[PDB]
Design a protein around this ligand. Structure first.
Ligand SMILES: OC[C@H]1O[C@H](O[C@H]2[C@H](O)[C@@H](O)[C@H](OCCCCCCC3CCCCC3)O[C@@H]2CO)[C@H](O)[C@@H](O)[C@@H]1O
Ligand SMILES: *C(=O)[C@@H]1/C=N\C(C(=O)O)=C(\COC(C)=O)CS(=O)(=O)[C@H]1C(=O)OC(C)(C)C
Length: 265
């Protein structure tokens, strides 16, 4: 593999699209690699991690309980509700909804949670409260995936998303139990976690949330490290490429390979 930056560049050349990437030490916030780190990319389903950070903040304040059962109706459901469509009769707890959103990318679960935090405007307000002045959510699932060229709606930057994830996971804004819960949801991702593990060398930790949207949009927010440790946050977004999903996946994996082969920097 090339050095990480050279691999990132190669991925742009091959995809004809923009890549944005940060590699950051989880414990300290040291930025190791940055590419288009201040440029905007659609969050797609990666927003669901920040969403459940906002839910957890409400739990910590005594304004929410992960146990609380939410009952909902079939007419509430949007496209791709693998977990939530199973629970029309019995409902789902707030914690189950976050598990479904983060680990299954259940869109209706995400919208049910978004309602509880004041919708897209409420989530954006929460982001501002934790000092992210850049990331914004404007729409609900599934319109937030539109990825229109030049549209600032529903975007983050690699730098802001990495800093925000670090704040949620480590900064004691959330309680110890809540930090542990958010981490565990990412560890438990079923959409990409097992696939990623199948290609990672033995000894490498992964926790993640992935996303995909229109116009080639694709992304991952992850924790990665050797010695079975979540050493670094890695955030990679792709936009405005006509490439197949398989090719987008393989380019992201190629960037991962470059990081793994050149880890000590
Ligand atoms: O010397 C380092 C390693 O080099 C190879 O490992 C390869 C591995 O066989 C391949 O499957 C992976 O693909 C990359 C898979 C990455 C998966 C996605 C990563 C995510 C995680 C963080 C967010 C962005 C991308 O590359 C590594 C590095 O060459 C050897 O197989 C392995 O025995 C050795 O320990
Ligand atoms: C988040 O990025 C997305 C959310 N849900 C979703 C869907 O709306 O269909 C997913 C579909 O997963 C598949 C391929 O079965 C999860 S996802 O991460 O792939 C994503 C998304 O919208 O994906 C596309 C529909 C754009 C492929």
């Amino acid at each position: 593999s090339p050095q990480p930056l050279e691999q990132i560049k190669l991925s742009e050349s091959q995809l004809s699209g923009r890549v944005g990437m940060i590699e950051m030490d989880l414990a300290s916030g040291r930025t190791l690699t940055a590419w288009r780190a201040d440029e905007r990319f659609p969050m797609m389903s990666t927003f669901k991690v920040v969403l459940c950070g906002a839910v957890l903040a409400r739990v910590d304040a005594g304004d929410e309980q992960l146990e609380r059962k939410i009952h909902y109706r079939q007419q509430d459901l949007v496209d791709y509700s693998p977990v939530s469509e199973k629970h029309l009769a019995d409902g789902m707890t707030v914690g189950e909804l976050c598990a479904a959103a983060i680990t299954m990318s259940d869109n209706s679960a995400a919208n049910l949670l978004l309602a509880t935090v004041g919708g897209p405007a409420g989530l954006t307000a929460f982001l501002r409260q934790i000092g992210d002045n850049v990331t914004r959510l404007d729409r609900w699932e599934t319109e937030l995936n539109e990825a229109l060229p030049g549209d600032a709606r529903d975007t983050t930057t690699p730098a802001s998303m990495a800093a925000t994830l670090r704040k949620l996971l480590t900064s004691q804004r959330l309680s110890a139990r809540s930090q542990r819960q958010l981490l565990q949801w990412m560890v438990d991702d079923r959409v990409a976690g097992p696939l990623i593990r199948s290609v990672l060398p033995a000894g490498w930790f992964i926790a993640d949330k992935t996303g995909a949207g229109e116009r080639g949009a694709r992304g991952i927010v992850a924790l990665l490290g050797p010695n079975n440790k979540a050493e670094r946050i890695v955030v990679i977004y792709l936009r405005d490429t006509p490439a197949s999903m398989a090719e987008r996946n393989q380019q992201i994996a190629g960037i991962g390979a470059a990081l793994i082969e050149h880890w000590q920097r």
